[PDB]
Write a protein that binds this ligand. Structure first.
Ligand code: G17
Length: 335
């Protein structure tokens, strides 16, 4: 009965008063009220079952969210789906509503060094847990960082974005992607997530994304314009030879030091930024090393930076539906 921008949300009576937040390739997110627990929530409706890849992404989302519990990662409240597998065509994942996000905050505010520092700390604390579980986030960016009024930050994965027709918040954007993704089909690592954080830190230090551009080649040109042309050593770390020939073909660009781009930035912040935005993924700083960096010394406390107790280590969509039915069973009434 409640319908929001053409999507029915079969979610009452417990949850009511829906309001649109955004949509993606196969689902939609609204705010809503929880009457059982008397709290504002967010609810992600997804309809993945006709397509194999959406089913894979959905199973992965569910398994991760069941296992994960961390103060800097969005947490699951409930999963609503039909009592019968044949009847189940939509799944709704419920989590607590956060007031705002970094993407919105960056539009209205130049952030102080103190705020940058605390936000970066929480990003890294949350990411330490994700990475300790041997999970890759793969799409860190400001729209995927929730905030509230007291500067608490929570990592999100909003999910696969809507077709972009060749400016708004939930589009797929490439600005935070590591160069090895641009340059290679997947041999991807934790390191890509650290590059993304580097890009987010650079953006906090300024008023704009550091590596924009319409195509990969425009971005790579911006990247090379700041980092300088790759050393021979860096060229050798590029595994796809077609891509390595191409960088090899470009004019030499000199390195622009970070303190020339951000003349007013904290020098410790810039030292950490440099270590995150390193072209060679093997030399890129790892999440635990980043937490221990002098920039974060006000907050660093490994005894209070949890690791996951339960690390992770082909299928037809119909089979993936079964698996999804099983994983959601715990939230059914009769359990
Ligand atoms: C409702 C909901 C359900 C599921 C998810 N899923 C995840 O965040 C997710 C999925 C896969 C992996 C991971 C992660 F990060 F690796 F742990 C997270 C997010 C949400 C979600 C989406 C948007 C939200 N927006 C807000 N606030 C609006 C920005 C103002 N608050 C809570 C939200 C919560």
């Amino acid at each position: 009965p409640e319908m929001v921008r053409g999507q029915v949300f079969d979610v009452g009576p417990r949850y009511t008063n829906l309001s649109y937040i955004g949509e993606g390739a196969y689902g939609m997110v609204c705010s809503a009220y929880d009457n059982l627990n008397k709290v504002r929530v967010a609810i992600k409706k997804i309809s993945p079952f006709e397509h194999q890849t959406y089913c894979q992404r959905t199973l992965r989302e569910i398994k991760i969210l069941l296992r994960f519990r961390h103060e800097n990662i969005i947490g699951i409240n409930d999963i609503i789906r039909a009592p019968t597998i044949e009847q189940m065509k939509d799944v709704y994942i419920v989590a607590d509503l956060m007031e705002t996000d970094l993407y919105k905050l960056l539009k209205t505010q130049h952030l102080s060094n103190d705020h940058i520092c605390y936000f970066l700390y929480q990003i890294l604390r949350g990411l330490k847990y994700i990475h300790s579980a041997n999970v890759l986030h793969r799409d860190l960016k400001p729209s995927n960082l929730l905030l509230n009024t007291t500067c608490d930050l929570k990592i999100l994965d909003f999910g696969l974005a809507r077709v972009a027709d060749p400016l708004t918040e939930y589009v797929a954007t490439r600005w935070y992607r590591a160069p090895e993704i641009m340059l290679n089909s997947k041999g991807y690592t934790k390191s890509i997530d650290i590059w993304s954080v580097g890009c987010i830190l650079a953006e906090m230090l300024s008023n704009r994304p550091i590596f924009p551009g319409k195509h990969y080649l425009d971005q790579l040109n911006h990247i090379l314009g700041i980092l300088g042309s790759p050393s021979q050593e860096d060229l050798n770390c590029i595994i796809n030879l077609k891509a390595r020939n191409y960088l090899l073909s470009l004019p030499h660009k000199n390195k622009v030091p970070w303190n020339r781009l951000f003349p007013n930035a904290d020098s410790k912040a810039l030292d950490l930024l440099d270590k995150m935005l390193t072209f060679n993924p093997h030399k890129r700083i790892e999440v635990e090393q980043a937490l221990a960096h002098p920039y974060l010394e006000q907050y660093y406390d490994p005894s209070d930076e949890p690791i996951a107790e339960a690390p992770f280590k082909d299928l037809p969509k119909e089979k993936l539906k079964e698996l999804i039915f099983e994983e959601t069973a715990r939230f059914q009434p009769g359990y």
